[PDB]
Amino acid sequence: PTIFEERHLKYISQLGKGNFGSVELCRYDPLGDNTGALVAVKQLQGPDQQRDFQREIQILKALHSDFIVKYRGVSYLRLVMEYLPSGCLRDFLQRHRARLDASRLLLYSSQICKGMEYLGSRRCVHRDLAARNILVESEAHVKIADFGLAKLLPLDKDYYVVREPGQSPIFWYAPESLSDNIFSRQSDVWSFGVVLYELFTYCDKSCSPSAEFLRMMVPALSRLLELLEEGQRLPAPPACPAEVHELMKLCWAPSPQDRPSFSALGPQLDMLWS
């Protein structure tokens, strides 16, 4: 049930790639007759990376929420998760933009905020919150995924300092992450603000965090950190409700201690409805 025999995991396709592993679509088919259930299987494509992967597995196994991708088990080596055929929220928002209204965007925002609130209560920093890392379960249900960069906060420290700088697109990182590699539940809040912006632009590539920050934009990271320190922010998405934009601005407070908490954002997102 929680142990998946390797010989019964039948390879179908690649669901994703992202340093230093792959997510594959597999069918767990012990009968070998193509009637078994579909599963998403993560594996490393390294000694420290192996320690990193086993930590990811321990983090995800211990998470139990409707807004967090379900852990199924392991195969001995590989992490088995539930398969969400709708895939990432980024690509989903692009294919269904003429269908999802403000209410719907607000429902996804609420569900993600509930998921982050729960991660925070687990002393877990996600570090990579973005629409491409969030999965769609159904039309009215999103779940947070990709815990490959997630960190557990020690009981006496509310932040974590990363040794080597990030390998993710710089446009989701908080100023303190860009300058000092400081990651905390508050830097996750900053990233959540960028997710709100992604939602309200339906992840449109022309006004995307990368496209729009680059045109507002010496190394690029230092230049982005300069824009941000001056108080420059991403513009309100086209037709964005003022209140949603005011929330993104709060998430984007310069000092981590001034950003609203996930528990304060939730009732506010729910009040705007869905």
Ligand SMILES: *CCC(=O)N1CCC[C@@H](Nc2ncnc3[nH]ccc23)C1
């Ligand atoms: C945006 C493309 C996309 O759908 N992605 C990014 C690559 C990894 C994919 N992960 C994934 N897809 C389906 N079901 C999953 N369960 C766990 C991880 C899963 C998402």
